[PDB]
DNA sequence: TCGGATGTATATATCTGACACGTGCCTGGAGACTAGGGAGTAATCCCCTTGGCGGTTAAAACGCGGGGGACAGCGCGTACGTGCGTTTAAGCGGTGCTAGAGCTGTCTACGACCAATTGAGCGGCCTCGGCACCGGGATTCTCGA
DNA sequence: TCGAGAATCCCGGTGCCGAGGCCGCTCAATTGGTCGTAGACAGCTCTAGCACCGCTTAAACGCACGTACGCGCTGTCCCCCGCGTTTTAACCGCCAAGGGGATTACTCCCTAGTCTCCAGGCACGTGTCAGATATATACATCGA
């Protein structure tokens, strides 16, 4: 039950960074759900890369490749 | 005995977290969530701290963009508070179902 | 006696390394003589523009060392570089400080 | 593990532009990832262009067309001009 | 004088234009527009019929997708009519602007 | 100009296919503008493709390649 | 000299192993191509084509038509929940759009 | 000119023996096959380049399939691919 | 509009930990020469794309109700900011240590590659049945009453 | 409820042209050998990821109170839909031509390939200063 580990003030901080003034109650649950979906999608490809590499450790480069395949290029890790 | 009128503390924060770059989510809970999610794909799978940090930052940026989109959608509806319907509209327009 | 191809073209980026990477990338059966020179020139110009914007953005903050935040500010503020890197996330970069006019009181 | 990077060359470019500045390690890693991404993007577009015209050689014409396709307007014009200038100087010497 | 209620002749034609697979834009004006737009790139160009047909199909699909997205945006703002602010909202959320 | 060749009934038919009940008067000009922008974006890439082949005819391959470049793959033309 | 049995028949497929091998070799994907890679790719392509054609034929049958047209392709792609996201960024020429009217817009 | 026309027709008749296909539908099927082929081949080549491998084998194509096909599609695709590979080897 | 009480940069000392500089060496980038194959050049010639003319008319432009929806104003009560004690757990520092990534050494089974060669797939020619279309009829929404 | 009116599905009859099949008939996929070598496999090393353990403290949280505003209700009014009337240029068929997009033949010159050597750039060690941090001050603003 670590999806609740992303606390309500964390979502509030992210919304403030995005520039949001007021927050509804259901926003926390909805953002937890969408984050869970996004991490599932990215980690699926990362683990697939790890499987194809015959490795048991997920290096940052595999995560970079998974993000690139999803249309979200990441700079600063390789 | 004073009190800050609603709205000012939201900006005292919106400016603070926009002018400064941080992670905004506790490292260990997010790492535990990442490991829990990855457990459903491969058992006893190890990770790297760099990979955890990359996932952290990617999730931060994704939600930040999603929050900008949903804020704009809420403002379009003559509103200020963001509702879950705003998130759903943003995700449907972006194509993420 | 030996002169590097980078200096022969008046460039800084490695023409030889670009040629080797073009050979190794399985991009095509053969690589022309001037293709690595052209690609290195394009990369050099793009890096020159990026570093110039990063440097003057950093100087705007009275910092003489360029950090990823300065890179993010430089890329997002410029119209064309933002278009080129619209779907790119810069680690530890942050976002442009902007608040919608309706939100202000 | 002889890892290759673009550190020295990008540092040279910075000293060419701003002689009194420096790059942090994270920012330099972002520079390396930016140049690698742009290089692979242009090379892939040039390979696609060569394969589309039944051509089996990457020349300056293919790189020119690729950079014209990927970069925005004024960026494309400036990059094409600088690349042609570099190609001509290389050819002269 | 039988007068249909304003609104039924909308959903009626909507069923028809969703059931059909036509191109909904007169071919000659669109070809003229394509020739004009390409005139600003190269003088004295020639266009194959397949090329203009592909351009028309792509524009058709793009515009129907944009119209679906802006309909969703207009619905979100508690409205039935689509207005330009919905158009820029959809285009901005889609990352175009 | 020729952008006026995209008539108001054409915009109405496109909205109907998209599933829209009522059109405001300002929709037509904005739709013409966005259509012009999209056509310029695609035609630039198509014409560059036909220049690279040293050809003065814009084939269907150039159009489909341009559309695929902007992530708008089109099926049915070669 | 023995009988020239095709590789597709040897693998029990319908898509060409030889042609896919040639396209993989000439596509500049890799310096070398394994023996089983064309077989695997031909099998995957054949399965995908079979799924698309099955759903397209079902859609055509729903329309009381025998021959398959692009409209049936569009219906088959956009009705399924996986082929839709596999082909979410593509457009089917003359395929139109699937019928969908928002419940809010309906009268009463 | 190379086209998957007869091959798609054979698959159709295997699945729907009493169903025809139009020329435009056949062209769309050919375009779909080419797109999926180039996508999977590009992903396999990318995997080989990432893992410093000079050849693409059934493993690379399998991983590319798993990456580019969602959920049940990937499972059935890898099932058919493994079946065909096992049939071919024996 | 201001007494006044905050979180807003500003002004200056202290570590301090990343940063840029000697450095050396080995390994990939230059010079040197072949050759032979991809590509430019030349001719050609036939498809097809541009151009334009006449007839039909489906479609577009325009005008006129008028009604239903966009929008402004008010009331409310309801959910959402704000201090605050706390308690909950998160970084922060130190070590154990061990699965596991990374680099080495055989060498073997697998992938080019080239000489027949042949059957499968491609181009051209019927050819007829699916499907588009039209016209009359039964059937199903609709909107004023 | 409801019935005239208006679409709408439907079914029969007619046409016509693309889907399909057949028949040559090239050419590229198959066989069968060598020939080299990529990575398959086993093994050694060292390294960084996992686990614990305790500390100090940021912050998460559950809880109160005030009130901003999200939403519903009322009303206005205006502009967009539906339909009738009047252009009009889109469409279809046709013919003409020229031009340029593919082809075939011929060099030809440019890059893959191989041998040699060297210098540069990357891993290593290190002295150094750009900047975070701690402490006190100007200062644009919620209530009468």
Describe the protein:
Helix content of chain A is 60%, strand content 9%. Chain A is mainly α. Chain A has one domain (1-77): Histone, subunit A, CATH 1.10.20. Chain A is elongated. Chain B has one domain (8-97). Chain B is 66% helix and 4% strand. Chain B is built from four helices and two strands, in the order ααβαβα. In chain B, helix 2 (27-39) packs across helix 3 (49-76) and helix 3 packs across helix 4. The longest helix of chain B is centred in the middle third of the chain and has 28 residues, at 49-76. Chain B is extended and about 50 Å long. Chain C is mostly helical. In chain C, 53% of the residues lie in helices and 7% in strands. Chain C has five helices and three strands, in the order ααβαβααβ. Chain C has helices at 5-8, 15-24, 35-60, 68-77, 79-84, and strands at 30-31, 65-66, 88-90. The longest helix of chain C has 26 residues, at 35-60. Chain D is mainly alpha-helical. Chains in contact: A-B, A-C, A-D, A-H, B-C, B-E, C-D, C-G, D-F, E-F, E-G, F-G, F-H, G-H. At the C-D interface, helix 2, strand 1, helix 3, strand 2 and helix 4 of C face helix 1, strand 1, helix 2, strand 2 and helix 3 of D. Chain B binds a DNA duplex (145 and 144 nucleotides) through residues 2-10, 12, 26-29, 46-49, 78-81, 83. Chain C: The modification N6-succinyllysine is found at residue 83.
